Structure 1
Amino acid sequence: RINTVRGPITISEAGFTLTHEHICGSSAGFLRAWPEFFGSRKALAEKAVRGLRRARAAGVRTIVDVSTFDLGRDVSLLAEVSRAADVHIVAATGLWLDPPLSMRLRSVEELTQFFLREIQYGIEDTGIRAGIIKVATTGKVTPFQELVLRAAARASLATGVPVTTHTAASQRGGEQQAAIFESEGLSPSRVCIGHSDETDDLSYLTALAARGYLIGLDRIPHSAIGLEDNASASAFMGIRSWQTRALLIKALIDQGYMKQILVSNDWLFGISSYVTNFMDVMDSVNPDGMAFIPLRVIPFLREKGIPQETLAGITVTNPARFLSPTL
């Protein structure tokens, strides 16, 4: 069984699953302290329910919200929008790139206890258990980030829940992550190396898949175009087209690694952790939101000759194998 914000579900219930998404990208305590930053909590919730319902109509049945503590994860919000949209949401533990001081000062043993409490006991006082561990590193792994990755590996080994990562693909950062995970005795089949569509280095990706890692091609609609004077939507966006990113999926399929591929949008319905109104920038670039994968990428791959059963394997079978707790 897989833990969701509404309780446990069987593997067969998960269906078409988006493995790297967010309801809201924020900071610990921020949604509660300043909901008017998002208009209101109600407005944010209502936008998310419409968004999830659009995704559901395009075939999505489950999303994995990989928002951590320090991304301002509010599982009560996730539970509310999941119930109203009838879309399963898997919540995350772990730490992203903005840990507060009370986290930054902790040992690997302490972080392991924290990740374990969120998986085994529940998040806050909600009883909602995490079904995935999210971690992030920048280029060369910092000392604190290494502690996070080891704590993640140890919590995964104790519970069977998988680990999913944020990296800089342009720095081939998955290699350093993999080294740390393997030193801990973690199976690569429990690990998704994410934001992997941010590079054109196919050799780097194939090497990881060969070692048994899941490859997260999860920022496909963040491609953007026509924003090279933007001091925000050029370093956070790019200039590579989304079709170019999408073709990495075909490339990995053709090398015989369709079972290793996970695809997502890395979308959200509110964001406070960047510039004000960046949500408007994102929504203008990708009006499809979380429906971008099923509405654009899947038909694009089908028209490039990828068979239905392969597309179903990638969007249904692979996430189920990944999320089902396994040791």
Structure 2
Amino acid sequence: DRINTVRGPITISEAGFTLTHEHICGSSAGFLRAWPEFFGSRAALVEKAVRGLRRARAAGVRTIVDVSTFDAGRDVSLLAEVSRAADVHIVAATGLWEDPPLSMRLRSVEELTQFFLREIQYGIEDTGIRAGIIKVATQGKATPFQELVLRAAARASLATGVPVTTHTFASQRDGEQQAAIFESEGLSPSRVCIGHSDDTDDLSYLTALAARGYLIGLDGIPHSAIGLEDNASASALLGNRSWQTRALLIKALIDQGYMKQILVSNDWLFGFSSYVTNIMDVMDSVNPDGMAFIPLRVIPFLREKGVPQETLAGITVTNPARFLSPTLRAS
């Protein structure tokens, strides 16, 4: 009946329009508490995030999934404050992203499983806030540690029913190795979203995973450095493909019969310290609408291409509800 948020359980019906891959703040563990002035101030970051979430809410968003892990500087107390003030539901994540510290990198698959279970079953830190999704990452072929993370995520998912979502190098077809490892642990593809899949134009790679039951995370639609060609750091981060090109992958998967496997998001954030210093300012200049980009820009774009509104509502409301609803625990 219920999904865990940073404010407690909500019914599946209350989730509504859901962005399945977002960040309040992309940072590092302990960084926001040790150096809040990097973001101007903690209060400034809160105000910026609350305004951004209110803008998404006015455009119809009711829930976001914050896929920031421990090592991406997830601060669940910040998410809770920002969720309350904006009245947008936020689902928090466990797992590990691309910057685990030594204290994570040295751990066994059994130990990592216990850590992920702790954040789902007991709570994150001392807040009692329970994670509602598990996030994992590869950047090409998995390192041995990344394999352990994938297996621990699958084991925690099976034990708790909460879904798994991933970071990929889509152009290296990362989803295929991730799928192989998840299936070796007996995880159902319908409980796995292969994320950053709009970073590639290889439809055959995406449709092969979708045909296997995997969810395809088309989650970075406004990520584009067009017009920023002189900015090496922004170009490397955001790529030189247009948001229209990324958005047309949504239509392509619909046209090929895979609507039920699509999830869409912005992969936006309101603070960003794990990259070059000016990057949040640059991104905000590109996409002032922030997390409202999906409802304000992608939906009207696809509507005029002929995608029916009921199909778009199914992708943005029903598909995330099915994904986030916990399934039965194993045993």
State the distance in 2 between where 1:128 and 1:140 align.
Answer: 33
Task: Give the stretch that moved more between structures: 188-197 or 250-259.
Answer: 250-259
- Alpha-carbon distance, 1:279 to partner: 0.4
Q: Structure 1: which 4+ aligned runs deviate by more than 4 Å?
A: none
Q: Per the alignment, in what secondary structure is the counterpart of residue 298 of structure 2?
A: helix
Post-superposition Cα deviations, 1:163-219, rounded to whole Å, max 9, x if no partner, equal 000000011110010000000000000000000000010000000000000000001
Q: Percent identity?
A: 95
Post-superposition Cα deviations, 1:30-66, rounded to whole Å, max 9, x if no partner, equal 0000101000000000000000000000000000000
Report what 1:93 is aligned to: 94
State the distance in 2 between where 1:57 and 1:234 align.
Answer: 30
- Alpha-carbon distance, 1:128 to partner: 0.1
Task: Give the stretch that moved more between structures: 97-106 or 228-237.
Answer: 228-237
Report what 2:241 is aligned to: 240
- Alpha-carbon distance, 1:228 to partner: 2.5
Give the TM-score of the pair, scaled to structure 1: 0.99
Name the CA shift for 1:97/1:147 in 2 (closer, same or farther; >3 Å): same
Q: Per the alignment, in what secondary structure is the counterpart of residue 270 of structure 2?
A: coil
Q: Per the alignment, in what secondary structure is the counterpart of residue 222 of structure 1?
A: coil
Q: Per the alignment, in what secondary structure is the counterpart of residue 64 of structure 1?
A: strand
- Alpha-carbon distance, 1:85 to partner: 0.1
- Alpha-carbon distance, 1:314 to partner: 0.1
Paired positions, count: 327
Q: Per the alignment, in what secondary structure is the counterpart of residue 233 of structure 2?
A: coil
- Alpha-carbon distance, 1:82 to partner: 0.2
Report what 1:139 is aligned to: 140
- Alpha-carbon distance, 1:90 to partner: 0.2
- Alpha-carbon distance, 1:269 to partner: 0.3
- Alpha-carbon distance, 1:227 to partner: 2.3
Post-superposition Cα deviations, 1:217-275, rounded to whole Å, max 9, x if no partner, equal 00110022022332201111111111111010011011111110000000000000001
Post-superposition Cα deviations, 1:268-312, rounded to whole Å, max 9, x if no partner, equal 000000011210010011111000000000000000000011001
Q: Unpaired runs of 5+ in structure 2?
A: none
Matches within 5 A, 1:159-238: 159-238=160-239
State the distance in 2 between where 1:237 and 1:159 align.
Answer: 34
State the distance in 2 between where 1:36 and 1:267 align.
Answer: 21
State the distance in 1 between where 2:225 and 2:289 align.
Answer: 13
Q: Per the alignment, in what secondary structure is the counterpart of residue 3 of structure 1?
A: strand
Report what 2:106 is aligned to: 105
Q: Unpaired runs of 5+ in structure 1?
A: none
State the distance in 1 between where 2:153 and 2:4 align.
Answer: 17
Post-superposition Cα deviations, 1:144-173, rounded to whole Å, max 9, x if no partner, equal 000000000000000000000000001111
State the distance in 2 between where 1:235 and 1:40 align.
Answer: 28
State the distance in 1 between where 2:322 and 2:253 align.
Answer: 18
